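Record format v2
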Amino acid sequence: VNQNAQALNTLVKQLSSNFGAISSVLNDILSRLDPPEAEVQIDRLITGRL
Amino acid sequence: QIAPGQTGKIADYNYKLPDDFTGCVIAWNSNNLDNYNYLYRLFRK
C-alpha cells in the first residue's frame, strides 16, 4: 500500500517540476511566450513528463 | 519580421509566415528602381 501510494505521489509531484522549461505551469508558458518559442519550452515539459 | 513565426505590424496584421513554413526568404533594395504607392496596414480587428 505504501509503495503504490509513494509511487503515485512521486508521479504527481513530477508535474510541478520544471525539466528546464521556464515554468512548471503550462499556462505560464502559453500566456507569457509566443508560439515560436513557447513550443520549444513545452517540448521540455512533454519530454520530462513522458 | 519576414521569417517563420515572428511578430510586428507587418508580420501580424499585414502578411504572416507559419512556424512550419518550408522555404526561403530573399530581399534586395529598390530605392534606385521603385514614392507612396507602397501601402501597408497599421491596425486590424
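The CA atoms of residues 2 and 8 of chain A lie 10 Å apart.
DSSP finds three helices and no strands in chain A.
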